[PDB]
Scaffold this active site. Structure first.
Site, PDB file in Angstrom:
ATOM      1  N   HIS A   1       0.835  -1.192   0.000  1.00  0.00           N
ATOM      2  CA  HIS A   1       0.000   0.000   0.000  1.00  0.00           C
ATOM      3  C   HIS A   1       0.869   1.241   0.000  1.00  0.00           C
ATOM      4  O   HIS A   1       2.035   1.205   0.399  1.00  0.00           O
ATOM      5  CB  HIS A   1      -0.924   0.016   1.227  1.00  0.00           C
ATOM      6  CG  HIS A   1      -0.206   0.254   2.513  1.00  0.00           C
ATOM      7  ND1 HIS A   1       0.402  -0.758   3.223  1.00  0.00           N
ATOM      8  CD2 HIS A   1       0.031   1.392   3.210  1.00  0.00           C
ATOM      9  CE1 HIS A   1       0.970  -0.260   4.304  1.00  0.00           C
ATOM     10  NE2 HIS A   1       0.767   1.046   4.318  1.00  0.00           N
TER      11      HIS A   1
ATOM     12  N   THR B   1       0.872   4.697   1.926  1.00  0.00           N
ATOM     13  CA  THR B   1       0.340   5.583   2.946  1.00  0.00           C
ATOM     14  C   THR B   1       0.350   6.990   2.357  1.00  0.00           C
ATOM     15  O   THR B   1       1.389   7.628   2.274  1.00  0.00           O
ATOM     16  CB  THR B   1       1.148   5.505   4.232  1.00  0.00           C
ATOM     17  OG1 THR B   1       1.048   4.163   4.725  1.00  0.00           O
ATOM     18  CG2 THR B   1       0.602   6.461   5.281  1.00  0.00           C
TER      19      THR B   1
ATOM     20  N   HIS C   1       6.118   6.263  -1.036  1.00  0.00           N
ATOM     21  CA  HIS C   1       6.726   4.969  -1.280  1.00  0.00           C
ATOM     22  C   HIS C   1       5.747   3.866  -0.928  1.00  0.00           C
ATOM     23  O   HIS C   1       4.758   4.094  -0.225  1.00  0.00           O
ATOM     24  CB  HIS C   1       8.003   4.805  -0.450  1.00  0.00           C
ATOM     25  CG  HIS C   1       7.768   4.840   1.030  1.00  0.00           C
ATOM     26  ND1 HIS C   1       7.658   6.017   1.736  1.00  0.00           N
ATOM     27  CD2 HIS C   1       7.609   3.846   1.939  1.00  0.00           C
ATOM     28  CE1 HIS C   1       7.444   5.750   3.014  1.00  0.00           C
ATOM     29  NE2 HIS C   1       7.412   4.441   3.165  1.00  0.00           N
TER      30      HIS C   1
ATOM     31  N   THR D   1       6.144   0.137   0.736  1.00  0.00           N
ATOM     32  CA  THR D   1       7.032  -0.853   1.319  1.00  0.00           C
ATOM     33  C   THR D   1       6.757  -2.235   0.734  1.00  0.00           C
ATOM     34  O   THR D   1       5.609  -2.661   0.631  1.00  0.00           O
ATOM     35  CB  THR D   1       6.893  -0.867   2.836  1.00  0.00           C
ATOM     36  OG1 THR D   1       7.252   0.429   3.343  1.00  0.00           O
ATOM     37  CG2 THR D   1       7.798  -1.932   3.475  1.00  0.00           C
TER      38      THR D   1
END
Ligand SMILES: [K+]
Length: 141
Positions: free
Chosen positions: A24, A26, A103, A105
């Site tokens: 995902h 954020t 970004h 992860t």
């Protein structure tokens, strides 16, 4: 007054190998009371077209910190500014502690950079979730 909610985006496609359960972005971080969720949802709904119009892309992976391997994200700057400003005006705490460095992860491991041709990440859904808690709102296009 610690951050306690996130606005996340999940995708239809991820063009990299990953070890996390569901990658995902954020997109935004909030500090709110639970009874403010309806107001946050209202803003998400007002901004729904704009959010889903974002052209989110990725082109490489990298280490963001020790043991945090991520994919870069581009395409969310101008929309981030708008939602940041709407929340700020509405006196809803947003993005006051979180660095803007979009970004996704992928793995908790020390790994080398992978480069790909610029790839659009199709949005699957956008959601509001308690940090370390449940999703309280999810919207699709
Ligand atoms: K600052």
């Amino acid at each position: 007054a610690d951050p306690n909610y996130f606005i996340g985006i999940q995708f239809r496609n991820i063009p990299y190998k990953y070890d996390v359960k569901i990658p995902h972005l954020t997109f935004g971080v909030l500090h709110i009371s639970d009874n403010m969720v309806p107001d946050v949802i209202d803003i998400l709904k007002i901004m729904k077209n704009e959010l889903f119009k974002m052209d989110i892309t990725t082109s490489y992976t990298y280490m963001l910190s020790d043991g945090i391997y991520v994919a870069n994200v581009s395409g969310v700057l101008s929309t981030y500014f708008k939602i940041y400003n709407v929340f700020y005006k509405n006196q809803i705490t947003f993005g006051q502690s979180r660095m803007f460095i979009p970004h996704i992860t992928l793995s908790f491991n020390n790994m080398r950079t992978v480069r790909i041709e610029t790839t659009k990440l199709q949005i699957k859904s956008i959601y509001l979730r308690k940090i370390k808690g449940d999703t309280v709102f999810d919207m699709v296009e």
